[PDB]
Write an enzyme that holds these catalytic residues in place. Structure first.
Site, mmCIF file in Angstrom:
data_model
loop_
_atom_site.group_PDB
_atom_site.id
_atom_site.type_symbol
_atom_site.label_atom_id
_atom_site.label_comp_id
_atom_site.label_asym_id
_atom_site.label_seq_id
_atom_site.Cartn_x
_atom_site.Cartn_y
_atom_site.Cartn_z
ATOM 1 N N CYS B 166 0.803 -1.225 0.000
ATOM 2 C CA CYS B 166 0.000 0.000 0.000
ATOM 3 C C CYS B 166 0.839 1.280 0.000
ATOM 4 O O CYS B 166 1.435 1.619 1.025
ATOM 5 C CB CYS B 166 -0.920 0.017 1.223
ATOM 6 S SG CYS B 166 -2.074 1.417 1.232
ATOM 7 N N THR B 167 0.879 2.019 -1.114
ATOM 8 C CA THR B 167 1.758 3.185 -1.116
ATOM 9 C C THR B 167 1.160 4.410 -0.434
ATOM 10 O O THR B 167 1.914 5.340 -0.136
ATOM 11 C CB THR B 167 2.214 3.559 -2.543
ATOM 12 O OG1 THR B 167 1.170 3.301 -3.489
ATOM 13 C CG2 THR B 167 3.455 2.761 -2.911
#
Lengths: 75, 195
Positions: B166-167
């Site tokens: 998850c950026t």
């Protein structure tokens, strides 16, 4: 022979393989080098998604070929 | 005559230099539409325009592949960054902090807030962000908490070794680090709406 596995994010993995190795075996060698679980790996060559039960030779994959490794990368 | 008090000049100079970097990465000559889309995205912390479909993944590869030989910043592109940010004569530590903040910004570009979604993320932007972070590590390892934290962020960008991907979280994590240790550099880089 040597092949290269390149993620879409630009990480390149070098593998030692035989033409008779299956796609499953290649995913296991990717896991040994980079810790990616095989069930999360989608391998692509010549635009085709590589099937677990087939061999590298079934896709005309040769020495120094590059396979593309597609991972689900969450935003 | 300075039209802005000293502590506010960053709010004007930062967006200027980020725009110049966008013009370097996304040439108006060949990539005018994506150039505009990257500029427009800086104006708010949410984007309805997403770049996760196969065509967008292909388009961004066209743009970033020449900048990332072997997954690292090319020497020529790194010099162009230094010129745009007037860092050619700066300390490696100042260069590293700037590159770290640019990495954070491109992490945000790839996140669910901008051109990514909950479940997908443009890999070229993740690769560019990680290469910026790699160069910062080479320039000044000491701006990072540890080699272990560098490797965690790097593995998250690439989806290696079982790391989460998850950026939005990766970008938030690096942004928190920059806010703690070099907030003025961060203010000089991050689009105002993303701060």
């Amino acid at each position: 022979m040597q092949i290269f596995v390149k993620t879409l994010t630009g990480k390149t993995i070098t593998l030692e393989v035989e033409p008779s190795d299956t796609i499953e075996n290649v995913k296991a060698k990717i896991q040994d080098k980079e810790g990616i679980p095989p069930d999360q790996q989608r391998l692509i060559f010549a635009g085709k998604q590589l099937e677990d039960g087939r061999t590298l030779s079934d896709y005309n994959i040769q020495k120094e070929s590059t396979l593309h490794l597609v991972l689900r990368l969450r935003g | 005559h300075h039209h802005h008090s000293s502590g506010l000049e960053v709010l004007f100079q930062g967006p200027r230099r980020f725009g110049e970097l966008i013009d370097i990465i996304l040439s108006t000559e060949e990539h005018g539409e994506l150039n505009q889309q990257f500029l427009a995205a800086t104006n708010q912390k949410h984007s309805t325009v997403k770049l996760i479909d196969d065509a967008s993944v292909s388009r961004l590869a066209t743009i970033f592949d020449p900048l990332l030989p072997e997954g690292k910043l090319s020497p020529a592109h790194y010099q162009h960054i230094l010129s745009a940010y007037h860092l050619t004569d700066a300390t490696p530590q100042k260069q590293a902090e700037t590159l770290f903040c640019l990495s954070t910004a491109f992490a945000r570009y790839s996140s669910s807030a901008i051109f990514g979604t909950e479940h997908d993320s443009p890999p070229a932007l993740r690769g560019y962000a990680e290469a910026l972070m790699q160069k910062a590590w080479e320039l000044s390892p000491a701006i990072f908490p540890s080699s272990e934290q560098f490797t965690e962020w790097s593995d998250r960008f690439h989806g290696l070794h079982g790391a989460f991907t998850c950026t939005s979280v990766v970008a938030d994590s690096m942004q928190r680090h920059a806010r703690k240790y070099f907030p003025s550099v961060l203010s000089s880089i991050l689009p105002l709406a993303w701060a």
